[PDB]
Design a protein around this ligand. Structure first.
Ligand code: YE3
Length: 441
């Protein structure tokens, strides 16, 4: 298949729902390449666990951990890595308040080439155990021959764009990886990179990052169809930021306006937001503890009750994952009957201004607080006008090259009147979870 979009393995589903899924041990296996060194970009790390996920023969190859921790949290991570002499750390600068290093990416340097993995899981056991998580696997990129001068660039500009993303860190350990990427041929890449990095972007940089980056790609590389106003927008996420007192402050002004862009010409577009209900969490494989990774606070939620009328339940019968709570984040543009999509994005970015950017300075500046990363699937990059939705995520469609594996059910189902969004810091003591327990923060 051309998309190379995978879900993580889920412990407890029937084998048919894990055949074609990937565990971290599979990604790092020698079958994927003979590891020379690796970089692990992430938010949360269990270093003892992480090293055990590498094949025994590769466990002493250099590993770089790229994180955003400061002060005591940084000291704790260094203490975790101190027993492993082969592990180096890079502290990503976070010079804007309330920003985080959320990007989840593996750079895997092999004797045979280079692989890039952009995904949604933290490097801890629970994120790969019973959650719905997403993975994009790059091709094996060959090394450009010494003395040969070629760009190694793809029609999606992925090589330059990935280098640009890494350059924003201004970090010596990542300049080393930039030099590795320069030496490899990434021309087969058929996805577009969408990153966020912290800063305040104007002018020639406004379109580099966040939702303006998405808007620019959709303007340049998608086409607007008749009745485009009837094609919904779907956003699916595991956390929600403070979006403002009403939908006009950010969600339906600048964020939705970027997401509904198609083509270069100049709204009643339906907006579906998918986020687990309390009942989704209670009846999940993990039970209420799944809500530890759905960090929507009551303090934030009570300021924006208008938002919850957009919320739809998590349902994933198509991938056998209705009870595997989502930590994947995805955004896409389905047709009015949900049979086709105009594009699909898998990313680390939750539904927040910190992740996607917020306009400042009278609309002239995009301010982003965090590091985020995702990849965008556009039909034009595959020689197509749209993607047909795969009916069963792991099934065998009539042509894999035209048929995109959407990991949850369409159409999304609106919350019922008794449903509530999962809010992690209030108690749930009316009905026990799948392990027999209540939730008492
Ligand atoms: O990147 C990701 O996917 C994630 C990012 N944040 C969280 C949080 C969280 C949110 C606000 C402030 C601190 C948090 N947690 C401290 C962890 S740490 O300092 O040890 F790294 C809580 C539950 C899950 C996630 C998560 O899954």
């Amino acid at each position: 298949n051309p998309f190379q979009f995978y879900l993580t393995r889920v412990s407890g589903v029937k084998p048919k729902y894990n055949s074609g899924a990937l565990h971290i041990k599979d990604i790092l296996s020698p079958l994927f390449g003979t590891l020379v060194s690796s970089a692990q970009f992430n938010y949360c790390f269990d270093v003892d666990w992480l090293v055990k996920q590498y094949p025994p023969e590769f466990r002493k190859k250099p590993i770089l951990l790229v994180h955003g921790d400061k002060r005591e949290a940084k000291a704790h991570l260094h203490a975790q890595a101190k027993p492993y002499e082969n592990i180096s750390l890079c502290q990503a600068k976070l010079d804007i308040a309330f920003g985080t290093h959320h990007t989840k990416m593996m750079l895997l340097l092999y004797e045979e080439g280079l692989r890039v993995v952009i995904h949604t899981s933290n490097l801890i056991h629970a994120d790969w155990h019973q959650k719905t998580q997403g993975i994009w696997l790059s091709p094996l990129y060959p090394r450009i021959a010494d003395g040969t001068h070629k760009s190694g660039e793809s029609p999606t500009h992925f090589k330059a764009d990935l280098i640009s993303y890494l350059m924003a860190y201004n970090a010596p350990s990542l300049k080393e990886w930039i030099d590795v990427i320069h030496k490899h041929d990434l021309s087969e890449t058929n996805v577009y990179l969408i990153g966020s990095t912290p800063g305040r972007f104007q002018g020639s940089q406004k379109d580099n990052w966040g939702h303006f980056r998405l808007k620019k790609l959709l303007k340049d590389h998608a086409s607007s169809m008749p009745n485009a106003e009837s094609w919904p927008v779907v956003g699916q996420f595991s956390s929600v930021g403070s979006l403002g007192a009403d939908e006009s402050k950010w969600l339906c002004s600048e964020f939705k306006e970027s997401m509904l862009t198609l083509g270069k010409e100049s709204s009643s577009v339906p907006l579906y937001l998918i986020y687990p209900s309390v009942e989704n969490v209670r009846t999940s494989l993990e039970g209420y503890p799944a809500g530890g990774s759905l960090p929507y606070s009551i303090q934030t939620a009570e300021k924006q009750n208008w938002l919850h009328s957009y919320f739809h339940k998590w349902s994933a019968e198509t991938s056998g994952r209705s009870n595997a709570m989502p930590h994947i984040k995805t955004y896409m543009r389905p047709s009015p009957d949900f049979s086709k999509i105009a594009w699909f994005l898998v990313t680390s970015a939750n539904l927040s201004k910190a992740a996607w950017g917020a306009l400042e300075k009278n609309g002239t500046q995009l301010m982003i607080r965090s590091y985020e990363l995702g990849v965008l699937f556009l039909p034009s990059a595959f020689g197509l006008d749209s993607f047909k939705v795969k009916q069963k995520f792991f099934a065998g469609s009539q042509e894999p090259m035209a048929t995109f594996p959407v990991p949850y059910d369409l159409p999304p189902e609106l919350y019922g009147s008794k449903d509530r969004p999962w809010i992690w810091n209030i108690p749930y003591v009316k009905a026990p979870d799948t392990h027999g327990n209540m939730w008492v923060p």
